[PDB]
Amino acid sequence: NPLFSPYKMGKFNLSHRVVLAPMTRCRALNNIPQAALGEYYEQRATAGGFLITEGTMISPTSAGFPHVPGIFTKEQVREWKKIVDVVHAKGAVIFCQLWHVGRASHEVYQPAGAAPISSTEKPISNRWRILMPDGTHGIYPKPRAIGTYEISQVVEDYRRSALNAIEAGFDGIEIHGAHGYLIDQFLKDGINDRTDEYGGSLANRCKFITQVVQAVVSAIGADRVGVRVSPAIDHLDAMDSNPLSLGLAVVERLNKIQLHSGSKLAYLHVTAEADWEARLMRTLRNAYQGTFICSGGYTRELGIEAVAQGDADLVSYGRLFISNPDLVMRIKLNAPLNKYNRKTFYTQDPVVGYTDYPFL
Numbered sequence: 019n020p021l022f023s024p025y026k027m028g029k030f031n032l033s034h035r036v037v038l039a040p041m042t043r044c045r046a047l048n049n050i051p052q053a054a055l056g057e058y059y060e061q062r063a064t065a066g067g068f069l070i071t072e073g074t075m076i077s078p079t080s081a082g083f084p085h086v087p088g089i090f091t092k093e094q095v096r097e098w099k100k101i102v103d104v105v106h107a108k109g110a111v112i113f114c115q116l117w118h119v120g121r122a123s124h125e126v127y128q129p130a131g132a133a134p135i136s137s138t139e140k141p142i143s144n145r146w147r148i149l150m151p152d153g154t155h156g157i158y159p160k161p162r163a164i165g166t167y168e169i170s171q172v173v174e175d176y177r178r179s180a181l182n183a184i185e186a187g188f189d190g191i192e193i194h195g196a197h198g199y200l201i202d203q204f205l206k207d208g209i210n211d212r213t214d215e216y217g218g219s220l221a222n223r224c225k226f227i228t229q230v231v232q233a234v235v236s237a238i239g240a241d242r243v244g245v246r247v248s249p250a251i252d253h254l255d256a257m258d259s260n261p262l263s264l265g266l267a268v269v270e271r272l273n274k275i276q277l278h279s280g281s282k283l284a285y286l287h288v289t290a291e292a293d294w295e296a297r298l299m300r301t302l303r304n305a306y307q308g309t310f311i312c313s314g315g316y317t318r319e320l321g322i323e324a325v326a327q328g329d330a331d332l333v334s335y336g337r338l339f340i341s342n343p344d345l346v347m348r349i350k351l352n353a354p355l356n357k358y359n360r361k362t363f364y365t366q367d368p369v370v371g372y373t374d375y376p377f378l
């Protein structure tokens with residue numbers, strides 16, 4: 019089984035290649051990491067295994083989901099510390115995903131009911147609806163197009179949050195630049211309609227993610243920084259006219275950051291449509307100089323084939339890891355997997371649909 023050959027991700031020598039994909043679960047009540055999160059990540063931590071946390075707020079304006087964890091307050095750092103200690107006691111590596119939703123928010127998630135921020139004033143179309151705190155669905159409002167000065171302020175929010183994650187004990191951070199959120203709102207030309215130095219060409223549309231990565235690289239080191247992108251996922255109106263060219267453009271900037279800093283990034287994480295000429299996943303893998311994590315609709319057989327054929331170094335699993343706390347062990351034994359319940363993906367109960375999925 020190639021999924022269980024060791025792999026060196028930076029200075030972390032992983033003993034297997036099954037990765038916990040970042041997944042918002044909405045159990046960190048009032049943006050404070052609860053003890054249920056520690057129980058949740060502990061059930062899934064393995065000796066030498068790599069875990070990536072749910073999307074985590076970098077600022078009071080970065081949330082678009084209810085009760086998502088933050089890492090911008092001193093209290094959030096202290097509560098994260100207890101979760102990382104429990105995970106590290108299992109011998110696992112854990113990264114915190116820094117997540118800014120951009121225009122994918124609502125007045126109920128913003129301080130003083132203010133409008134969300136984005137690269138543009140165009141809202142997400144009415145075809146998509148946002149989950150509300152009370153379980154209903156609402157309307158995405160018109161965002162506020164920020165200037166270049168506020169762009170640098172948001173970049174500083176990524177930097178301070180990356181330092182707070184290291185202070186909390188995290189082995190590193192992952193930059194969430196996928197799924198049509200703030201960073202994706204600058205990348206995709208279907209959203210970015212700016213005429214300044216952040217819009218138009220591929221270089222201008224890649225400038226934001228370049229500066230975000232450069233900030234966290236300079237703060238905590240490149241080998242503790244991961245980057246996640248999804249050039250060919252149209253979630254929340256995140257369309258690009260040439261997703262293959264955009265992904266290669268982002269990879270080019272990542273290779274250039276690694277040569278300037280003289281050190282390799284932790285990994286490049288690429289997720290795609292789970293319902294899958296060579297794939298875009300392999301093309302981006304061939305272009306990137308470093309560790310590659312494939313994501314999207316992978317199974318035990320597909321994950322084994324991806325590492326064996328050289329398509330990826332690590333394979334992250336999402337929905338299967340929700341319902342299988344010992345997913346790594348079940349993949350090793352080829353044991354049958356549990357079904358997951360979508361109804362409790364974003365509910366608030368600290369046990370129901372969160373930690374009560376049975377082990378093997």
Ligand SMILES: NC(=O)[C@H]1C=CCN([C@@H]2O[C@H](COP(=O)(O)OP(=O)(O)OC[C@H]3O[C@@H](n4cnc5c(N)ncnc54)[C@H](OP(=O)(O)O)[C@@H]3O)[C@@H](O)[C@H]2O)C1
Pocket residue numbers: 042073145146147196197251253
């Ligand atoms: N922080 C993050 O980055 C994560 C947060 C959100 C989810 N996640 C990714 O995002 C996409 C969307 O997946 P999903 O199936 O949950 O899309 P949904 O439409 O929201 O699924 C909810 C259900 O609600 C149904 N449903 C029913 N009506 C609707 C309407 N009007 N709009 C949206 N969804 C609706 C819908 O049925 P559909 O497959 O679209 O025909 C769906 O089955 C996927 O690639 C996830 O991995 C990323």
Ligand SMILES: Cc1cc2nc3c(=O)[nH]c(=O)nc-3n(C[C@H](O)[C@H](O)[C@H](O)COP(=O)(O)O)c2cc1C
Pocket residue numbers: 039040041042043072073115194196197246289292313314315316334335336337338363364
């Ligand atoms: C409930 C749920 C929450 C998710 N939350 C995040 C998230 O916070 N950040 C992120 O980058 N991806 C998130 N994802 C997407 C997954 O990390 C991953 O890209 C995708 O689910 C892989 O598909 P798979 O379940 O077949 O492995 C989420 C997916 C689901 C179903």
